[PDB]
Design a protein around this nucleic acid. Sequence first.
RNA 1: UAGACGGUGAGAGCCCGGUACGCGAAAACCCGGCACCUGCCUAGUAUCAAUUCCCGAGUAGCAGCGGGCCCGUGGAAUCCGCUGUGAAUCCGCCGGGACCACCCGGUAAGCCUAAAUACUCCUCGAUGACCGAUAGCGGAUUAGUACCGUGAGGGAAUGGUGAAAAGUACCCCGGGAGGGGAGUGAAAGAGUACCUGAAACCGUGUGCCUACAAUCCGUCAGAGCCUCCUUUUCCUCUCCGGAGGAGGGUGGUGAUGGCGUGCCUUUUGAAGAAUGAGCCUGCGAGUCAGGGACAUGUCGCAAGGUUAACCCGUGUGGGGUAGCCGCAGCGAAAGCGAGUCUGAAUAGGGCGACCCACACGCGCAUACGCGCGUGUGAAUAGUGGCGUGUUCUGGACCCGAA
RNA 2: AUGCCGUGGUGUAAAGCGUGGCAGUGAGACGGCGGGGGAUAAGCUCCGUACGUCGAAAGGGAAACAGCCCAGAUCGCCGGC
RNA 3: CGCGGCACAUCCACCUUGUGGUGGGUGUGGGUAGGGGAGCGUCCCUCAUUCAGCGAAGCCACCGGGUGACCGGUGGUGGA
Lengths: 124, 144, 207, 62
Amino acid sequence: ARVKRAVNAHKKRRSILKASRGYRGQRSRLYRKAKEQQLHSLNYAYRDRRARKGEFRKLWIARINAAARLNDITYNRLIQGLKAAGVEVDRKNLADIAISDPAAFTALVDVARAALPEDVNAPS
Amino acid sequence: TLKLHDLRPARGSKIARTRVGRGDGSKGKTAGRGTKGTRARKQVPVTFEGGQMPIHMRLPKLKGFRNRFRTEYEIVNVGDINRLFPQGGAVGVDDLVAKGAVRKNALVKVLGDGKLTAKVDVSAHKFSGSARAKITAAGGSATE
Amino acid sequence: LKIDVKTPAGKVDGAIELPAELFDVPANIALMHQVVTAQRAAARQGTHSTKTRGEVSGGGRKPYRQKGTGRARQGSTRAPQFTGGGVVHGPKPRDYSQRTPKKMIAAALRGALSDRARNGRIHAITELVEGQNPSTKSARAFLASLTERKQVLVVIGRSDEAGAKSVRNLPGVHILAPDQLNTYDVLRADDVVFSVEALNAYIAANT
Amino acid sequence: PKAKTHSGASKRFRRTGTGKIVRQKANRRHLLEHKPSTRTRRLDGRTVVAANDTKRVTSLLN
RNA sequence: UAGACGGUGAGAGCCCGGUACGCGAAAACCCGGCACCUGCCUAGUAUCAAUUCCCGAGUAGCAGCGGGCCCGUGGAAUCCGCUGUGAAUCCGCCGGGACCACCCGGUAAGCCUAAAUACUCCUCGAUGACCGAUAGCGGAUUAGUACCGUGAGGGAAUGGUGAAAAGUACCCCGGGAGGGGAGUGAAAGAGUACCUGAAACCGUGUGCCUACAAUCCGUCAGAGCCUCCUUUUCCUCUCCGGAGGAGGGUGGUGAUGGCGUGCCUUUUGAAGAAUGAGCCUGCGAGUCAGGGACAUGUCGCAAGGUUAACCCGUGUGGGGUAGCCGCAGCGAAAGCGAGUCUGAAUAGGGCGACCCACACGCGCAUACGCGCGUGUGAAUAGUGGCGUGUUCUGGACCCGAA
RNA sequence: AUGCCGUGGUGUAAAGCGUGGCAGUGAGACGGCGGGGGAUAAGCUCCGUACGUCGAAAGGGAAACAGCCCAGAUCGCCGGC
RNA sequence: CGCGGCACAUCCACCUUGUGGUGGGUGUGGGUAGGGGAGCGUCCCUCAUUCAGCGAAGCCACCGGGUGACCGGUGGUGGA
Ligand SMILES: [Mg+2]
Ligand SMILES: [Mg+2]
Ligand SMILES: [Mg+2]
Ligand SMILES: [Mg+2]
Ligand SMILES: [Mg+2]
Ligand SMILES: [Mg+2]
Ligand SMILES: [Mg+2]
Ligand SMILES: [Mg+2]
Ligand SMILES: [Mg+2]
Ligand SMILES: [Mg+2]
Ligand SMILES: [Mg+2]
Ligand SMILES: [Mg+2]
Ligand SMILES: [Mg+2]
Ligand SMILES: [Mg+2]
Ligand SMILES: [Mg+2]
Ligand SMILES: [Mg+2]
Ligand SMILES: [Mg+2]
Ligand SMILES: [Mg+2]
Ligand SMILES: [Mg+2]
Ligand SMILES: [Mg+2]
Ligand SMILES: [Mg+2]
Ligand SMILES: [Mg+2]
Ligand SMILES: [Mg+2]
Ligand SMILES: [Mg+2]
Ligand SMILES: [Mg+2]
Ligand SMILES: [Mg+2]
Ligand SMILES: [Mg+2]
Ligand SMILES: [Mg+2]
Ligand SMILES: [Mg+2]
Ligand SMILES: [Mg+2]
Ligand SMILES: [Mg+2]
Ligand SMILES: [Mg+2]
Ligand SMILES: [Mg+2]
Ligand SMILES: [Mg+2]
Ligand SMILES: [Mg+2]
Ligand SMILES: [Mg+2]
Ligand SMILES: [Mg+2]
Ligand SMILES: [Mg+2]
Ligand SMILES: [Mg+2]
Ligand SMILES: [Mg+2]
Ligand SMILES: [Mg+2]
Ligand SMILES: [Mg+2]
Ligand SMILES: [Mg+2]
Ligand SMILES: [Mg+2]
Ligand SMILES: [Mg+2]
Ligand SMILES: [Mg+2]
Ligand SMILES: [Mg+2]
Ligand SMILES: [Mg+2]
Ligand SMILES: [Mg+2]
Ligand SMILES: [Mg+2]
Ligand SMILES: [Mg+2]
Ligand SMILES: [Mg+2]
Ligand SMILES: [Mg+2]
Ligand SMILES: [Mg+2]
Ligand SMILES: [Mg+2]
Ligand SMILES: [Mg+2]
Ligand SMILES: [Mg+2]
Ligand SMILES: [Mg+2]
Ligand SMILES: [Mg+2]
Ligand SMILES: [Mg+2]
Ligand SMILES: [Mg+2]
Ligand SMILES: [Mg+2]
Ligand SMILES: [Mg+2]
């Protein structure tokens, strides 16, 4: 029972080339050079779903740091004073109050300044 | 009723074949060989240990000869005469064949392992020594 | 257990008692699956061939010198990676015929005929056509009085040639002698119609 | 075709009644003056094929 | 008694060639019967005597060197070739595995002999869990042709309009080629470059991006545009609708920011400046044979299980007991045998055999036990098929030398 | 000092051992520590080490950087330490 | 660690108390050579059923689905 190979083989060729639209050069026209980039494109994507949770935190910290130094406190002593007062707001929403509501960010900086100890360099 | 599409084989009687050399998700490129040496392209004979003198030439031969004229005897115990023939009677070479205790067209020999309580009258080639003692103790006889 | 004979264009005249040791064996599907598979293996003709790289015509010499060209070295023009060359591990002519034990063959036929008789699918007649010249028009109308199904196994004796010729070209009627019954043809047919000369010559071959 | 057996292993091994495989011991055919009787009695008789050679020896006898 | 198979403008027992079934042979050949014709026989048979004669010659035998047999010169018979020597005709001669004696068997050196067995260039009739144009024969097509070589030899590629040519009258641009309008057709999205018409590769149009930037060509973050759909409110011409704007959502594009050293092989280690790959399409490597070997899953029967050749059946079915494996082992063997070998051993070992989970009964007893019954009715087991994993002999996973 | 062998405790699922089916491997690499050969040279060479990592291990750190330091990726998240 | 999906092993309860399913704990899931387990897709045949000149195969595009090999829907093209 001789089996021609074309009907089976052309099912993985189409889904590679449909997922390779937008690529330039031979990486969107040819099957062999597009299967290689899909090895790279789906590895980088796995690499970057796990890395974008510390890119947004790297962006949320950089904006809280800017909104704290207008209310003359550092990012260093802001996280300390919020933990000492028992405020469990995450850094995503604390860097969105920093833009969308700058007057309620100051009312949080004034709580993180009161629960902070009297001499922050003294031994505890 | 039963039709040809109600006939499936029993569970476990038919497992699928192992096709090899069909991609990296199964036994892949080397097909379970992995090597680059002899085992990757050929077989190695069983009669070969790498150059040292093998196990079939180190050891000495078993001693002796084989008797070309050896006469064998098929064997029934006297405790099987009891179980097969519980009332006794004439126990010939032909009645031990049909009851399934000895083979066809062979010289028989009655040995003596078991307990014989039946009163048998057994005819066979070449009785044993402890077999004649247990047959005559039950009141029987033992002829050639 | 009690199967009664029906005459063509008539009513019940007699009865045949089916033995329990021949028509009430329990069903064993894995035993019947091996027997039916081993029969259709024996029907394969197995005539299918290819050519390996030594049977293909020509292709003896080495097509060019091995070193110095920039081509790959090839060795024969009929090596199997060539277009038009030999076939590796191709079909050769085979024989599919399984050596199934006798007690397994004969205990699937008894198990299939038991399943027919347990559901009222065994019919006994005395003759298909009432005379001696064949007639398919009268044989078709009589089988419709028995069964209204698409597959019928008419088991008649070999000397009855008028009843044989009267059911040759009906669609869904298979004819076989009583000593040629097998598991595949009894499980295919929805209904089995024995002749009374055929059913008595099947019971008497099994006591 | 039919499976041949090894003519050398059939002359050096045999089977007991329960499937063990036995052999004779070496260092006993000649040069027997300097070997004390504590050594020729250790090398006398038969022993069982060791458990690491029992797979190649079984597939030479069969 | 026909529902085989094909043809017919698309799946036909009832439209055609056919099929089932049944008729048919001037002549030629073949088989058979009967006559003609030809040939052979038509005198010995039985009993007895036991003297003689004959029973296949350069042969048997022996010896030298070889061949072949399970048998490789070995203790080497039987059989065959050459060289030399070279018999006996039944009270003979030859064989029975050196050789001898007895006993058994047969008549060498003359010839002929059906059947069962092996094969298919070719001829009829069927069939395919075989191929369907890179497949199957090298050969569906000028095929052993074209072509290559002095020669022996090697040896391709090339199928498909439509149901029917109805194969595009005529007109127009053009030298033609090719095309446009008509026209045939169900369809010209079938035009003798012709069924379906994929991919690489090549254009034309069009949306967004791109001429200050260092880019394994992507990926996560991401503004802006373009496109197409749509909740609130304006024109409400509103049965309208979206006309426009703000929102929301698909699809295309991606200014810009971060991260990021191709695939494969082979390697201690490769993005590697180690190897292989220009690209796409088709093809290209663990297969088969065997009651083979070992181990396993499953099914049948079970102290038994199973047949091989072959035989009868339209077939896959029914017969077929020769054989094989199991049933008792030990020993070099004779042999003995639940034992046996070694040994001077009723010493010890080797290998083999042997249920105390069980009350009871026994000469048991501080208790378990010892041996044997009764079972409370303890748990052994093989063998045949079909799958799978390895293995043996074959080319044996595929490709490659000098 | 460690290491090793036996034993009595206590702790610990995927430890050990016997016997079958199918293997692969038998070219190793650097780093810590103890040594030989070398000139107490080598990214050198040859041994020891219930020593480690690479091999066959991605991530974070050392600017880059198989073998060093931290830590062993089942998948998802615009949470936290 | 948090919250949610899957997978294997083991323990513990229930049901054919086992050939297995139900529920709850707890542990575990990088991987080359290599070993074991369960599946996808193509072609041929048998059986049963169901579509098809009111448009099958094949091919193309779009919208969808599965833990993976991959699958379903609508349309266009096409002609068994
Ligand atoms: Mg792009
Ligand atoms: Mg994190
Ligand atoms: Mg590969
Ligand atoms: Mg190897
Ligand atoms: Mg190597
Ligand atoms: Mg290799
Ligand atoms: Mg040597
Ligand atoms: Mg050849
Ligand atoms: Mg060659
Ligand atoms: Mg070919
Ligand atoms: Mg048979
Ligand atoms: Mg000696
Ligand atoms: Mg001595
Ligand atoms: Mg037809
Ligand atoms: Mg007609
Ligand atoms: Mg010779
Ligand atoms: Mg003799
Ligand atoms: Mg003569
Ligand atoms: Mg003669
Ligand atoms: Mg002759
Ligand atoms: Mg002949
Ligand atoms: Mg013939
Ligand atoms: Mg023919
Ligand atoms: Mg061809
Ligand atoms: Mg084609
Ligand atoms: Mg010429
Ligand atoms: Mg024209
Ligand atoms: Mg036109
Ligand atoms: Mg028209
Ligand atoms: Mg059309
Ligand atoms: Mg063309
Ligand atoms: Mg075309
Ligand atoms: Mg610019
Ligand atoms: Mg730079
Ligand atoms: Mg970028
Ligand atoms: Mg190197
Ligand atoms: Mg390179
Ligand atoms: Mg380069
Ligand atoms: Mg190299
Ligand atoms: Mg190159
Ligand atoms: Mg290539
Ligand atoms: Mg069994
Ligand atoms: Mg023996
Ligand atoms: Mg003993
Ligand atoms: Mg093991
Ligand atoms: Mg080595
Ligand atoms: Mg080494
Ligand atoms: Mg080393
Ligand atoms: Mg050192
Ligand atoms: Mg070094
Ligand atoms: Mg390696
Ligand atoms: Mg790392
Ligand atoms: Mg490790
Ligand atoms: Mg690192
Ligand atoms: Mg880094
Ligand atoms: Mg894993
Ligand atoms: Mg893990
Ligand atoms: Mg692997
Ligand atoms: Mg139409
Ligand atoms: Mg249409
Ligand atoms: Mg098809
Ligand atoms: Mg699809
Ligand atoms: Mg379509």
